[PDB]
Amino acid sequence: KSRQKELTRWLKQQSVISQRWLNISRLLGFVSGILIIAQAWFMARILQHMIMENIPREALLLPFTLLVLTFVLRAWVVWLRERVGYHAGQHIRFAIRRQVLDRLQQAGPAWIQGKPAGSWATLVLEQIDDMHDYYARYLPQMALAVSVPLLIVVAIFPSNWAAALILLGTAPLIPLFMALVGMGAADANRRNFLALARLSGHFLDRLRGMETLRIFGRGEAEIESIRSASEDFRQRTMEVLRLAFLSSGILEFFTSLSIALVAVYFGFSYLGELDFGHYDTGVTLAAGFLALILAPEFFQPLRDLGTFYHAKAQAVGAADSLKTFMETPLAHPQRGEAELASTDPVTIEAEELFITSPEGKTLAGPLNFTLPAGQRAVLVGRSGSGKSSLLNALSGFLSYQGSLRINGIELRDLSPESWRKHLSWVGQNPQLPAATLRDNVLLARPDASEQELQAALDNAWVSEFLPLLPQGVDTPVGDQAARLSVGQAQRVAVARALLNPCSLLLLDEPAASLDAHSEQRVMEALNAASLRQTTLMVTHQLEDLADWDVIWVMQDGRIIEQGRYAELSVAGGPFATLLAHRQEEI
C-alpha cells in the first residue's frame, strides 16, 4: 500500500496496550460534547430573555447559576480528559520500551555493537517519547472529531432542521477534500520529514568534519554548500506544502461558510424572507443562538486536529524506525539446558566451526582447533581475522553452525546462565558499567569478604593507584570511566576477572592501546592468572609469547598455523611475517 498507512496501522496496533484509558478518553469526549450543548442552550435562553423579553438580569439567576455550573463541569472534564490522555500514552511507551530493551537484551552484545550506543539511546529515549503525543493527544482528538460534530447536529435537529443541515451538509465534503488531493501529499509530507532529518545529518556532518574542512581551506566553500542544501530543501518542501495547507485552508473555509450560512438563514428567517426551516413554528431567537454558538464548536474538534498534525508526523517518523527494529530478523544463539558437572578447567574442541553474525553473515571460517584442559592458547593475526568472533562464540554471544564442544558437551546444549558462571572475560575495552569503583570490581559476585576484594586489588595492581583518586576505592566512575584513565581503567577490569574462581578465561587484546606503564602491570597479572585454568588470549604483542604453550594464527577467518613460539619464530610461516611487522613498531 503506502509506507504512510503501514505505520499508522502499526501505531494503531500498539494502542491496544492501553485501550481502557483510550475509552475513558473517548467517553469523556462524549460527555464534553454534551456539556457544550448544555452550555449553548443556557446561553441562548439567557440571551433571548434579556434581548427579546427585556427581562432584567436579576430575574435570570437560575440559568446563570446553571450556566456557571456547566462551565465548571467542562473545565473538570477538560482537566480529566488530558490526565486520562497522558496515561493512554505512558502505558504504551512503557510497554514498547520494554519491547525494545528486551529485543536488545535478547539479541547478543555483537548485535548492539553494530550501531553506536548513542544511536541506541535515540531509539529508546527520543524516538519512543515522540510517540506520546500521538496516543495522548492525536488519538483522543481524532475520536473527539466524530463524537462532538455528530452530537451537535443531533441536538440542533429538534430545534431546526435547516441549521442542522447547513452544518451536516459540510460534514462529508471536508473528509473528501482532505482525502481527494491532500492524501496524495500527506505521504509526500512524510518524505519531507525524512529529508529535514537527513538535512540535519548533513549539517552535523559538516560540523563533525570541520577539522578536515579547516586544513583544506574549504571553510567558505562549504558555507555555500550549506546554503545550497538548505535552499533545495526549502524549495522541495514548498512544492509540497503549497498543497498540504489547502486542508488547513479548506477546513477554515467550510467553518466560515457554515457560520455565514447559519447567520444569513436565521437573519433572513427573522425578517420573513425565509420560511421553511422551522417545524411550522416561529423561529425563536434562542433557536438561532443555539445554532450559531454551536456552529464554530462543530468544526472545533477538526480544527484542533490540525494543531496536532506534528504529533502524528513525529510519531510516524518514530514508528518508521521502531517498526523496522522489531521486524528485522535476528539469529539468536541456541539456548540449551545442559550444565557442566564440575568447575575444573574445560577442554575446548571444534570441528568445521562457522561463526555467524546476527544477520547470518559468516565471521569466522572453518576452525578445527582443539584445546586441552589447562592449556593457555594464543590467537594472533592481522586485523579483521575474526579472532574476536571466536572469543565471542565461546561466550555465547554468537551462533555457530559447526561443533564446539566444551568437555564434549556441545555449546548449544549449554544453558548460558550456568555456563557463564564458568567464564571470565577481559576484552579490548573495559566498559565498566557500575557507578562506584568498589562495585565495579565486585561485579563478579556482589558480596565478597574484604580479604577477597583486597586480594583482587593487589593482584591486579589496582592498589597502587587508589591514592591518586580523590575518594580512593569508593570513587565514582562517571560517564564512560571519565574520572579515571584508560591505563588504569583496564586494570579495574582485570581485578573484576580475577575476583571469582573460573574454569575458562578469555582475554581479547588486554594491552591494546594502553598506557606504557599500565601495559606492563596488566601483563604481569594475566600471565600469572592464565596458569590456573584454560585460557585463550588474543594479542598482537608477539614478542613475549614464549611461555604460552599453544599459538594459533588466524587469517581470513580460519586458523592456518599452530604450535609453540619456539618453532614458529624460525619456521618462516605467517607468524614470522606477523612477528616481523610487529618488531618495527616502537
Ligand X SMILES: Nc1ncnc2c1ncn2[C@@H]1O[C@H](COP(=O)(O)OP(=O)(O)NP(=O)(O)O)[C@@H](O)[C@H]1O
Binding-site entries for ATP: 371-378
- Contacting residues for 567 by C-beta, under 8 A, at least 6 apart: none
Which one of 24, 31, 38, 74 is in contact with another protein (CB under 8 A)?
Answer: 74
Min dist CB 399 to ligand X, Å, is 11
Query: Inter-axis angle of helices 486-497 and 516-529, to 10 degrees?
Result: 10
Interface with another protein includes 366 (CB under 8 A)?
A: no
Residues that bind ligand HEB (CB under 6 A): 189, 192-193, 196, 237, 241, 244, 247-248, 306-307, 309-310
| Smallest separation (angstroms) from another protein to the CB of 126 | 9
Q: Residues 70, 127, 269, 388: which binds ligand X (CB under 6 A)?
A: 388
Does residue number 558 form part of the binding site for another protein (CB under 8 A)?
Answer: no
With CB under 5 to 8 Å by kind, the binding choice for 386 among another protein, ligand X, Mg ion, none is ligand X
Q: How far apart are CA 487 and CA 470, in angstroms?
A: 17
Do the Cβ atoms of 538 and 379 come closer than 8 Å? yes
Closer to ligand HEB by Cβ: residue 237 or 300:
237
The binding track of 77-106 with respect to another protein, each residue x by CB under 8 A or -, is -xx--xx--x---x--xx--xx--x--xx-
Q: Pairing state of beta strands 353-356 and 362-367?
A: antiparallel
Exposed/middle/buried for residue 214 (C-beta within 10 Å: 0-12, 13-18, 19+): exposed
Tell me whether residue 198 or residue 581 sits nearer to Mg ion (CB atom).
581
C-alpha cell at 127: 524516538
User: Pick from 308, 425, 552, 565: which binds another protein (CB under 8 A)?
Assistant: 425
Question: Tell me, what DSSP letter sits at residue 343?
Answer: -
Partner interacting with residue 244 (select from ligand HEB, ligand X, Mg ion, none; CB below 5-8 Å by kind): ligand HEB
The distance of closest approach from Cβ of residue 483 to another protein in the complex, given in angstroms and rounded to an integer, is 14
Structure-block grid coordinates of residue 97: 520500551
Identified binder of another protein from the candidate list 281, 342, 383, 451, rule CB under 8 A = 383
For the bound state, the minimum distance from the C-beta of residue 468 to ligand X, rounded and expressed in Å, comes to 30
Give CA angle at 239 (243, 251), nearest 5°: 15
Q: What is 401-421 written as a DSSP string? A: SSEEEETTEEGGGB-HHHHGG
Q: Which helix (H) or strand (E) holds 295?
A: helix 286-307
Using CB under 6 A, count the residues that bind ligand X: 14
* Residue 231 vs 359, nearer CB to ligand X: 359
The enclosing H or E element of 237 equals helix 223-244
**Residue 586 lies near another protein (rule: CB under 8 A):** yes
Per-position x/- string for 365-404, each x denoting binding to Mg ion as judged by CB under 5 A, each - no binding:
-----------------------x----------------
Given 357, 415, 429, 541, the residue binding ligand X (CB under 6 A): 357
Q: Which three cell numbers stand for residue 23?
A: 475509552
E-strand spans in 262-329?
Answer: none
Contact between 386 and ligand X per CB under 6 A: yes
Q: What angle do CA 232, 236, 240 make, to 5 degrees?
A: 165
- Name the residue number minimizing CB distance to ligand X: 388
Stretch that binds another protein, among 3-11, 57-65, 166-174, 465-473 (CB under 8 A): 57-65
Site for ligand X contains 501 (CB under 6 A): no
Query: Strand 534-538 relative to strand 504-508: parallel, antiparallel, unpaired?
Result: parallel
Helices 3-14, 309-327: inter-axial angle, 10-degree rounding: 90
State the nearest-atom distance from the C-beta of 545 to Mg ion, in Å.
Answer: 16
Three-class SS of residue 537? strand
Shortest reach from residue 531's CB to ligand X, in Å: 24
Q: How far is the CB of 344 from ligand X (least distance, A)?
A: 29
**340 class by beta-carbon count within 10 Å (0-12 exposed, 13-18 middle, 19+ buried):** middle
Counting contacts by CB under 8 A, is residue 227 touching another protein?
Answer: yes
| C-alpha cell recorded at residue 301 | 474538534
C-alpha cell at 218: 574549504
Quick one: DSSP state of residue 543? G
Q: Which is nearer to ligand X, 160 or 388 (CB)?
A: 388
Dist CA 176 CA 255 (whole Å): 15
360 touching ligand X, by CB under 6 A: no
Interacting positions 291-310 with another protein (CB under 8 A): 292-293, 296
Least separation, in Å, of the C-beta of 252 and another protein? 4
Q: Where are the beta strands (DSSP E) in 455-549?
A: 504-508, 534-538
For residues 22 and 350, which CB has a smaller minimum distance to ligand X in the complex? 350
First to last CA, the chain: 61
Binding to another protein by residue 62, rule CB under 8 A? no
539 lines the binding site for ligand X (CB under 6 A): no
Q: Is 341 in the site for another protein (CB under 8 A)?
A: no
Rounded CA gap, 58 and 62, in Å?
A: 10
| Binding partner selected for residue 238 from ligand HEB, another protein, ligand X, none, CB under the kind-specific 5 to 8 Å limit | another protein
| Residue 259 touches another protein, criterion: CB under 8 A | yes
Judged by beta carbon distances under 5 to 8 A according to partner kind, the member of ligand X, another protein, ligand HEB, none in contact with residue 189 is ligand HEB
Amino acid (1-letter code) at residue 256: S
Name the DSSP class of 531: G
503-532 binders of Mg ion (CB under 5 A): 508-509
- Residue linked to cell 504529533: 311
For 487, the grid coordinates are: 591505563
Residue carrying C-alpha cell 566498559 = 431
Binding mask 445-474 for another protein (x = CB under 8 A): ------------------------------
Report phi then psi at 558, rounded to 5. -130, 145
Chain residues binding Mg ion by CB under 5 A are: 388, 508-509
Chain residues binding ligand X by CB under 6 A are: 110, 113-114, 357, 361, 363, 383-389, 509
